[PDB]
Design an enzyme around this catalytic site. Sequence first.
Site, short mmCIF file in Angstrom:
data_model
loop_
_atom_site.label_atom_id
_atom_site.label_comp_id
_atom_site.label_asym_id
_atom_site.label_seq_id
_atom_site.Cartn_x
_atom_site.Cartn_y
_atom_site.Cartn_z
N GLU A 167 0.41 -12.14 60.73
CA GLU A 167 1.39 -13.18 61.04
C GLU A 167 1.44 -14.12 59.85
O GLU A 167 0.40 -14.56 59.36
CB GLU A 167 0.96 -13.93 62.30
CG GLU A 167 1.97 -14.93 62.83
CD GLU A 167 1.49 -15.59 64.12
OE1 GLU A 167 0.29 -15.93 64.20
OE2 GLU A 167 2.32 -15.76 65.04
N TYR B 248 3.42 -17.42 57.52
CA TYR B 248 4.20 -18.66 57.48
C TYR B 248 4.45 -19.16 56.06
O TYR B 248 3.53 -19.28 55.28
CB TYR B 248 3.42 -19.84 58.20
CG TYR B 248 3.16 -19.69 59.72
CD1 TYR B 248 2.15 -18.86 60.21
CD2 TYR B 248 3.89 -20.45 60.65
CE1 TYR B 248 1.89 -18.78 61.56
CE2 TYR B 248 3.65 -20.40 61.98
CZ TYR B 248 2.66 -19.56 62.46
OH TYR B 248 2.41 -19.51 63.84
N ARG C 50 -7.00 -15.00 63.60
CA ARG C 50 -6.79 -15.14 65.05
C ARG C 50 -7.66 -14.06 65.70
O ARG C 50 -7.59 -12.92 65.31
CB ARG C 50 -5.30 -15.01 65.44
CG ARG C 50 -4.40 -16.10 64.79
CD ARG C 50 -4.34 -17.40 65.62
NE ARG C 50 -3.53 -17.19 66.91
CZ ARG C 50 -3.80 -17.95 68.02
NH1 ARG C 50 -4.75 -18.86 67.99
NH2 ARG C 50 -3.08 -17.73 69.11
N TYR D 151 9.83 -8.75 62.38
CA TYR D 151 10.87 -9.77 62.28
C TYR D 151 10.50 -10.86 61.28
O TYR D 151 9.34 -11.04 60.90
CB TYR D 151 11.27 -10.33 63.65
CG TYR D 151 10.21 -11.13 64.41
CD1 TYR D 151 9.92 -12.45 64.08
CD2 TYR D 151 9.55 -10.57 65.50
CE1 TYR D 151 8.99 -13.19 64.80
CE2 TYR D 151 8.61 -11.30 66.22
CZ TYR D 151 8.33 -12.60 65.87
OH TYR D 151 7.40 -13.32 66.58
N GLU E 184 8.36 -24.26 65.47
CA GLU E 184 7.24 -24.07 66.37
C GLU E 184 6.77 -25.43 66.84
O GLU E 184 6.80 -26.40 66.08
CB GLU E 184 6.09 -23.31 65.67
CG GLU E 184 4.85 -23.16 66.52
CD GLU E 184 3.87 -22.14 65.99
OE1 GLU E 184 4.23 -21.33 65.11
OE2 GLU E 184 2.72 -22.14 66.47
#
Length: 189
Positions: free
Chosen positions: A85, A87, A121, A170, A176
Amino acid sequence: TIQPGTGYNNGYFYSYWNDGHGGVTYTNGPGGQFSVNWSNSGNFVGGKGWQPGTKNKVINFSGSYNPNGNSYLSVFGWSRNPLIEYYIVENFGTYNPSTGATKLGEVTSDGSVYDIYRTQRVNQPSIIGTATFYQYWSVRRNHRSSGSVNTANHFNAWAQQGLTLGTMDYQIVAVEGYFSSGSASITVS
């Protein structure tokens, strides 16, 4: 508001997810536009972009972003194999998401230095189910709510540092929030 889920709207992929706490509304507008309004929300992520993303996309965004509490405005997405993931954080509210994280370098792109970080995570929700996976971060020093993100500059800097990405899933410009309030109106292209 629209129903949490994913789909297409005016040629753009969109994803809207929340934890069911309440206090957040997300709407899709014309073209690449979306709006978020939240007041004492839980955890949510919403935005527009592409499914799948690419590793050389120049993403343009413009609008307003007014968080009151913990919230991010980022280019946000996932890769598979490895599951990551990621950012590229253009702005945030009360919490810098890299607080306490291991710094992995710096990259200069689109008018600012960004600091690079890696976090992990452990047994958390993901695009493939519960998993342990890394997160990659570029955090912009000069906050903004319009601009252009040359994603290749970030992905290449990450790779240079040993932060490898797999196949893109995606890739969106996302607001967020984590138990906060705010408003945002963003147009993507």
